[PDB]
Amino acid sequence: IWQPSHLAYITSMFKYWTGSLVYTFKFVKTDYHSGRVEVSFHPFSDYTTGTYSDYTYRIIVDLREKSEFSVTIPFISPVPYKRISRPDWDKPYSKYAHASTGTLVLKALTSLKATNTVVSNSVEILIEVNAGDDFNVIAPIENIFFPFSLSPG
Amino acid sequence: SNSGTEQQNPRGSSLLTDPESITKSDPYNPNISLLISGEVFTNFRNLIKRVNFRKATTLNGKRISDTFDINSLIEAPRLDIAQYVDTETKEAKYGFSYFWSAPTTLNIVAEMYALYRGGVRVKVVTEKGVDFVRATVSPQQTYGSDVAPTTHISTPLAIEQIPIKGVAEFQIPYYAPCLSSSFRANSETFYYSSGRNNLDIATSPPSINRYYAVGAGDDMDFSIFIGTPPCIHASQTAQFTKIKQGKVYDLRYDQYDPFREVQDGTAFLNARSIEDSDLL
Amino acid sequence: SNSGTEQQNPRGSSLLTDPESITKSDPYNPNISLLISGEVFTNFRNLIKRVNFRKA
Amino acid sequence: MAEQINENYENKQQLVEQTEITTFENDLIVLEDGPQMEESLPFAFHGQHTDNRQHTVVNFLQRPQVIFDSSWASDVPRNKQFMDSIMIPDDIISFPMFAEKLKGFSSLRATAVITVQFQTQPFQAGRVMLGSFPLPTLNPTRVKFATNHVSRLMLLNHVQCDIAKETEVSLRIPFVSPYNSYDLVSKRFPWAKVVGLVYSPLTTTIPVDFIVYGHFEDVELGCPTSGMLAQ
Amino acid sequence: MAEQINENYENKQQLVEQTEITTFENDLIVLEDGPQMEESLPFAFHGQHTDNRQHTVVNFLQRPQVIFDSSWASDVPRNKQFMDSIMIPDDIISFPMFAEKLKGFSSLRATAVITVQFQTQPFQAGRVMLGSFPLPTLNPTRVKFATNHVSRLMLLNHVQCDIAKETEVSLRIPFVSPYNSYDLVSKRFPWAKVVGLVYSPLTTTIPVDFIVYGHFEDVELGCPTSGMLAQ
């Protein structure tokens, strides 16, 4: 049984949501790795072919000594509220257009620079999700997740 | 003056000012609606509060539930074409029909406008022996799932007890993502403008006949004038052509209202709802 | 800023303050739950008052 | 706040330079150079290539754009179309002057202005009606019944033209939607369908020519976006 | 002035309404209608589709645009290119974000800003040079002799980067031409050719990655135009 996010569970009993979200990116590395990533928020669209990220509010962060990164992604949508739903990672925005505002993309601008004789070649990206400050949730006529208690063993 | 070269009464001008009187004097008489009628009518926003009967659920079994869409009640029901066949001479006669439905005060106003905003009021009348009636709303679509649950654990519940209150009155709020929602059918599928909600009326013990009367909630508001709907003459209800097995009423209707006589018209053979493409 | 060497969004900090917007501007829209929903939801202390069926 | 005692890494708050949309946040060093002590030539020396005015992206939307340029003879009667229907704003923003500008914007909330010209030598008669049905994709059940007949269009928001009196006619259609704006990346929810009927037929053989202009006012452009969807 | 005594035709100076660019001058009658007493919804009710900011066409040109995103190994030596040459502004304004906006404008006079990022873990060495040869189409005789060798590029307007020190580098190239502006409809007379040489080779096997950004400042846009030429 796939289990719900903290936000997924808390909004599980409602139907519509709104407000900004806060996506945090951790890079488990040293000061002796290096890399540029691009966090660009595409508010109404997908990231596909012909998608230039230069149209969009983006942040090009230089990860030499820096190690973490956290942005508040605003609520930009044609609807004052979007739909709470069953989450789907592998869907674009054009599907689930009713439940998401757009797509956010973390894109490499560069290979990871590292000398192999002292540090590794892999660095794990760790993504967290926080729910802003204006995050408002309405229409309590749904249930996506039923909770249950466990039995002592 | 009354005539000239410029447009003497365009729309934008008619909304605000009237042309000169034929008398070239004051043409207006004072409002005395309160003095004869005893009441004043100025806005359809108040008139839609009047509750009239809208649909009826008969053709299911002895069930304990009846789920159906809410926005479909703001629409006026579909008008159907009824095929009648003479049991003797076998020639066809053709009339009109409301299949277990009828419009409301609300539906006369809602069909002039494009969008709505506010809550809908639903009142139920059941058959004898029913003890309770319960109402709950649910989203009709668990978005992203091919199926919707059959229960819910945080939805609204509202219980009315028939033998001590014979009409089960419920009020269904406005739950939709947008400012003002849409209530007519469309083929839009990318994301939605209607708040798609179900409404489940239960009866304990389970019963067959459910009579529904609908009306406007306090917060009811329509948005964009679009125009007068397609109508049918009310006098056409009593006009009939006689055939062997009975009467064929031009406007055939069912016992949608649990307090109206059953009209003595024979059942049809086929029903076809008038499509927008059928208009000539 | 949005990035750095110190933990940019720990728990104790998330409870109180949000990180800078990607726009480097005000990211917040005004609450209009009362204007569309017709009601406001802020605390689960009130929502638990809702009675639903539990056992039989 | 979780308190943090840092002494080995500078809170490099500079090396953070937003340039309109893009924010660079940098470590090590940021360098910038060029020819020093920059001046500019006075405007007499150049400026033979520009007008004494600036054009934003809001104009370019306030510019009238030709949509139609055609005619209609005496063979078309009352209650029949004299011009093709126009979707607002799909049949307007699809012209290159507007589309090239709206690109890079999420959405559009503005009132649209449809203006129509009419050519008449003083011997011609007739009247013609120009109406707009709001949100035709949301109530498709009701579109063709409110637009197949005069006197069901004119009680809607309409504008008439006496062929022998009005040489120009302009209907102002304010934005109206269940939503806040008009999604540009998906072109979802047009807020009107302009249709053109014949209030009365022509009385001579000589057809009448017309030009249909369209622009926007009260323009609120959305958030910048890439604007590309999967297929 | 030739004096004119007119009494049969009104100097209809109204019925003359310019709308941003287009001037209508009309005879007979001009009519305009719509829903009366127009209001607007307050900004809380909508405006979830926009940012708290407006974007003109001058920004969209002040936005940095990625041109290159590549690498160069230790096999390339001094005086050899590590990045492809860039024509200013041809290889910049040909990206869709800029080209969609510059369309409808005659010309452009602005200073261009080429910024380049550099990725280094602290164990890598080397230096790299970024220069700009002015007006390469007007003096093609001299281009490849001023750009095939370091110490003939660096006496030109250039910007260097110590791989282990500078993580960003930005050269400001002011507009310079025999003319006033840069013809956009014919793309004639680019005012610089950015070239990138290797001041010193890499000392390890690990290549270096780089991103090349380009934008404009001091922007003077020309006259509005259709912008189409015969072929």
Side-chain angles (χ1 to χ4, degrees), chain A residues 1-87 89-121 123-153, chain B residues 1-243 245-280, chain C, chain D, chain E:
Chain A
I1 302 301
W2 294 344
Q3 289 296 302
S5 164
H6 181 64
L7 297 176
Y9 182 70
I10 290 179
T11 59
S12 49
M13 78 276 300
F14 290 90
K15 192 177 169 199
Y16 298 111
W17 62 268
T18 189
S20 71
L21 301 167
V22 175
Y23 287 2
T24 306
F25 298 91
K26 273 80 181 296
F27 296 80
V28 278
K29 68 177 185 56
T30 74
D31 304 335
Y32 299 135
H33 300 86
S34 185
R36 299 294 186 103
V37 291
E38 165 172 4
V39 188
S40 58
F41 168 57
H42 307 259
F44 276 6
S45 54
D46 293 318
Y47 190 78
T48 56
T49 56
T51 302
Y52 288 92
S53 56
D54 312 323
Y55 286 104
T56 57
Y57 287 103
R58 46 176 174 172
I59 292 180
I60 310 311
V61 40
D62 186 78
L63 274 315
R64 293 167 183 264
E65 291 192 347
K66 302 186 164 187
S67 76
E68 291 196 18
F69 178 87
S70 192
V71 292
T72 312
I73 299 296
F75 183 79
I76 290 89
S77 84
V79 205
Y81 285 80
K82 305 301 275 183
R83 190 83 169 72
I84 305 171
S85 75
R86 167 178 194 100
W89 279 335
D90 296 333
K91 292 286 175 70
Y93 167 75
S94 46
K95 304 183 259 314
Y96 273 18
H98 193 58
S100 184
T101 56
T103 58
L104 175 58
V105 55
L106 170 64
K107 172 177 64 172
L109 289 186
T110 184
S111 171
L112 186 130
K113 312 278 101 176
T115 304
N116 202 3
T117 69
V118 288
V119 295
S120 83
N121 302 287
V123 169
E124 190 161 20
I125 319 296
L126 296 151
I127 295 92
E128 301 169 8
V129 62
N130 187 0
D133 195 9
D134 56 345
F135 186 76
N136 202 342
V137 166
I138 68 168
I141 59 164
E142 203 186 15
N143 285 117
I144 303 181
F145 302 99
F146 298 139
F148 60 101
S149 52
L150 306 170
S151 185
Chain B
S1 71
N2 289 115
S3 65
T5 60
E6 313 171 341
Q7 288 184 11
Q8 285 302 122
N9 197 21
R11 187 174 186 276
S13 304
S14 287
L15 302 181
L16 287 74
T17 304
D18 295 345
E20 297 180 355
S21 169
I22 196 167
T23 68
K24 303 293 187 168
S25 184
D26 184 25
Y28 300 142
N29 292 320
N31 187 345
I32 49 173
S33 178
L34 176 64
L35 192 143
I36 297 172
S37 188
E39 49 185 25
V40 178
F41 173 79
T42 58
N43 193 3
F44 284 120
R45 191 181 314 284
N46 293 312
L47 181 125
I48 50 176
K49 273 73 183 286
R50 176 173 286 190
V51 181
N52 300 321
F53 277 89
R54 171 65 172 76
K55 72 183 291 287
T57 299
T58 306
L59 300 187
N60 292 321
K62 177 184 294 299
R63 298 179 60 93
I64 198 168
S65 71
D66 185 16
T67 310
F68 57 88
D69 194 20
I70 304 179
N71 307 310
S72 62
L73 301 169
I74 293 100
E75 269 185 0
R78 303 297 163 80
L79 187 64
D80 301 324
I81 289 186
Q83 181 179 8
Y84 297 93
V85 175
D86 197 348
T87 58
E88 185 169 14
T89 323
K90 289 300 183 302
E91 79 259 13
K93 298 297 181 65
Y94 291 131
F96 299 99
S97 170
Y98 282 114
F99 187 63
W100 294 101
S101 299
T104 317
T105 314
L106 170 60
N107 297 121
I108 312 183
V109 181
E111 282 297 342
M112 299 178 85
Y113 299 116
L115 302 179
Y116 79 104
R117 198 175 44 99
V120 184
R121 285 189 176 165
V122 173
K123 302 170 171 47
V124 180
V125 175
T126 69
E127 50 182 23
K128 284 192 177 181
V130 183
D131 285 330
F132 300 108
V133 169
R134 185 267 303 158
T136 296
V137 286
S138 56
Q140 180 179 7
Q141 294 286 127
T142 286
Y143 197 67
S145 173
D146 297 335
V147 296
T150 67
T151 52
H152 308 270
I153 52 163
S154 69
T155 40
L157 275 66
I159 306 175
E160 283 284 1
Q161 181 169 12
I162 292 305
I164 64 178
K165 180 176 177 279
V167 184
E169 304 177 348
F170 304 116
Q171 170 155 358
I172 292 91
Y174 177 87
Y175 284 149
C178 55
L179 202 271
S180 45
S181 175
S182 63
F183 58 91
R184 289 183 184 92
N186 60 6
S187 47
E188 189 69 49
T189 58
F190 185 54
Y191 49 92
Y192 299 101
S193 61
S194 182
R196 293 196 305 275
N197 299 314
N198 283 335
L199 170 69
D200 186 77
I201 281 95
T203 53
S204 186
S207 50
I208 302 163
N209 300 320
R210 275 81 175 269
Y211 300 98
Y212 299 108
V214 86
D218 206 347
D219 52 344
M220 275 283 285
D221 175 58
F222 300 127
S223 285
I224 307 100
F225 184 64
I226 58 173
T228 69
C231 297
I232 187 165
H233 296 178
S235 69
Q236 293 184 188
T237 315
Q239 305 169 1
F240 66 94
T241 308
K242 188 184 272 79
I243 53 173
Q245 71 264 32
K247 300 181 183 172
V248 173
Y249 287 102
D250 207 43
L251 191 45
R252 178 259 191 199
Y253 66 91
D254 281 322
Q255 194 172 21
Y256 69 101
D257 185 281
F259 301 127
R260 301 285 173 77
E261 288 281 347
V262 185
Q263 73 168 163
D264 49 357
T266 55
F268 54 101
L269 178 59
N270 284 316
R272 198 247 322 257
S273 298
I274 289 109
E275 298 180 347
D276 58 352
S277 58
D278 293 330
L279 296 175
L280 303 170
Chain C
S1 71
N2 289 115
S3 65
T5 60
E6 313 171 341
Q7 288 184 11
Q8 285 302 122
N9 197 21
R11 187 174 186 276
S13 304
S14 287
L15 302 181
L16 287 74
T17 304
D18 295 345
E20 297 180 355
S21 169
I22 196 167
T23 68
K24 303 293 187 168
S25 184
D26 184 25
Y28 300 142
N29 292 320
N31 187 345
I32 49 173
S33 178
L34 176 64
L35 192 143
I36 297 172
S37 188
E39 49 185 25
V40 178
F41 173 79
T42 58
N43 193 3
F44 284 120
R45 191 181 314 284
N46 293 312
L47 181 125
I48 50 176
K49 273 73 183 286
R50 176 173 286 190
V51 181
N52 300 321
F53 277 89
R54 171 65 172 76
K55 72 183 291 287
Chain D
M1 183 170 183
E3 72 170 3
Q4 288 155 342
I5 306 172
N6 173 14
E7 286 295 332
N8 288 115
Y9 300 126
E10 290 289 333
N11 43 5
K12 303 193 271 293
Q13 184 62 34
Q14 55 274 29
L15 308 95
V16 174
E17 184 64 32
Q18 181 181 9
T19 310
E20 296 298 308
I21 285 282
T22 304
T23 303
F24 300 160
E25 304 187 348
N26 294 312
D27 276 332
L28 228 36
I29 293 174
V30 171
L31 188 280
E32 173 173 7
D33 198 23
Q36 299 296 316
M37 281 200 192
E38 301 192 1
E39 286 185 14
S40 57
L41 285 80
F43 193 67
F45 296 76
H46 53 102
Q48 296 88 22
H49 70 277
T50 181
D51 50 355
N52 43 5
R53 182 254 188 84
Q54 285 296 321
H55 298 100
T56 173
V57 72
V58 176
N59 41 36
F60 271 106
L61 295 176
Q62 306 177 346
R63 307 183 175 187
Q65 160 86 234
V66 184
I67 289 115
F68 290 153
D69 199 356
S70 196
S71 59
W72 80 89
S74 54
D75 62 347
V76 48
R78 188 163 69 238
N79 308 287
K80 292 302 176 183
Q81 292 187 12
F82 72 92
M83 52 167 298
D84 284 328
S85 308
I86 302 180
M87 292 277 175
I88 310 293
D90 290 329
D91 292 335
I92 298 183
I93 75 173
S94 65
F95 282 89
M97 181 167 70
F98 296 170
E100 287 160 354
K101 296 307 181 290
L102 287 172
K103 186 61 179 294
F105 288 97
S106 67
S107 44
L108 172 59
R109 180 188 178 100
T111 75
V113 174
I114 299 299
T115 308
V116 179
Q117 314 283 347
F118 289 105
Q119 277 318 99
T120 293
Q121 52 108 199
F123 291 152
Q124 308 174 346
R127 193 176 288 255
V128 144
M129 163 178 306
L130 187 68
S132 82
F133 185 77
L135 300 174
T137 60
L138 284 90
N139 299 320
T141 296
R142 292 289 300 271
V143 173
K144 65 167 301 179
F145 180 69
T147 182
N148 66 352
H149 199 255
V150 152
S151 59
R152 283 198 291 267
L153 181 63
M154 59 180 295
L155 49 88
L156 193 39
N157 173 28
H158 84 281
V159 176
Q160 300 179 358
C161 147
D162 195 70
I163 296 305
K165 292 306 183 301
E166 283 77 15
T167 166
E168 182 176 352
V169 144
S170 52
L171 167 58
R172 293 189 64 258
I173 302 161
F175 177 89
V176 65
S177 174
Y179 282 175
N180 55 20
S181 51
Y182 168 81
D183 191 3
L184 288 176
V185 310
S186 62
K187 299 181 181 51
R188 288 298 182 261
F189 285 177
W191 69 84
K193 179 179 184 179
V194 172
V195 299
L197 278 299
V198 175
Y199 200 64
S200 178
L202 279 73
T203 58
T204 61
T205 322
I206 308 179
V208 180
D209 306 331
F210 67 94
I211 307 101
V212 174
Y213 300 94
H215 63 96
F216 302 94
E217 301 174 349
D218 303 330
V219 178
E220 286 184 13
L221 296 168
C223 173
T225 314
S226 64
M228 299 278 95
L229 291 169
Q231 58 186 3
Chain E
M1 183 170 183
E3 72 170 3
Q4 288 155 342
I5 306 172
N6 173 14
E7 286 295 332
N8 288 115
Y9 300 126
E10 290 289 333
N11 44 5
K12 303 193 271 293
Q13 184 62 34
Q14 55 274 29
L15 308 95
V16 174
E17 184 64 32
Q18 181 181 9
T19 310
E20 296 298 308
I21 285 282
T22 304
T23 303
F24 300 160
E25 304 187 348
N26 294 312
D27 276 332
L28 228 36
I29 293 174
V30 171
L31 188 280
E32 173 173 7
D33 198 23
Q36 299 296 316
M37 281 200 192
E38 301 192 1
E39 286 185 14
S40 57
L41 285 80
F43 193 67
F45 296 76
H46 53 102
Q48 296 88 22
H49 70 277
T50 181
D51 50 355
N52 43 5
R53 182 254 188 84
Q54 285 296 321
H55 298 100
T56 173
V57 72
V58 176
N59 41 36
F60 271 106
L61 295 176
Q62 306 177 346
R63 307 183 175 187
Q65 160 86 234
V66 184
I67 289 115
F68 290 153
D69 199 356
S70 196
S71 59
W72 80 89
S74 54
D75 62 347
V76 48
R78 188 163 69 238
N79 308 287
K80 292 302 176 183
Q81 292 187 12
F82 72 92
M83 52 167 298
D84 284 328
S85 308
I86 302 180
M87 292 277 175
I88 310 293
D90 290 329
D91 292 335
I92 298 183
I93 75 173
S94 65
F95 282 89
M97 181 167 70
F98 296 170
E100 287 160 354
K101 296 307 181 290
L102 287 172
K103 186 61 179 294
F105 288 97
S106 67
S107 44
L108 172 59
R109 180 188 178 100
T111 75
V113 174
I114 299 299
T115 308
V116 179
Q117 314 283 347
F118 289 105
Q119 277 318 99
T120 293
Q121 52 108 199
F123 291 152
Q124 308 174 346
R127 193 176 288 255
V128 144
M129 163 178 306
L130 187 68
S132 82
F133 185 77
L135 300 174
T137 60
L138 284 90
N139 299 320
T141 296
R142 292 289 300 271
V143 173
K144 65 167 301 179
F145 180 69
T147 182
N148 66 352
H149 199 255
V150 152
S151 59
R152 283 198 291 267
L153 181 63
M154 59 180 295
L155 49 88
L156 193 40
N157 173 28
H158 84 281
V159 176
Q160 300 179 358
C161 147
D162 195 70
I163 296 305
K165 292 306 183 301
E166 283 77 15
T167 166
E168 182 176 352
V169 144
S170 52
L171 167 58
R172 293 189 64 258
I173 302 161
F175 177 89
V176 65
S177 174
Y179 282 175
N180 55 19
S181 51
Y182 168 81
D183 191 3
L184 288 176
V185 310
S186 62
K187 299 181 181 51
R188 288 298 182 261
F189 285 177
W191 69 84
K193 179 179 184 179
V194 172
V195 299
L197 278 299
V198 175
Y199 200 64
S200 178
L202 279 73
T203 58
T204 61
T205 322
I206 308 179
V208 180
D209 306 331
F210 67 94
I211 307 101
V212 174
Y213 300 94
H215 63 96
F216 302 94
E217 301 174 349
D218 303 330
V219 178
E220 286 184 13
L221 296 168
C223 173
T225 314
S226 64
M228 299 278 95
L229 291 169
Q231 58 186 3

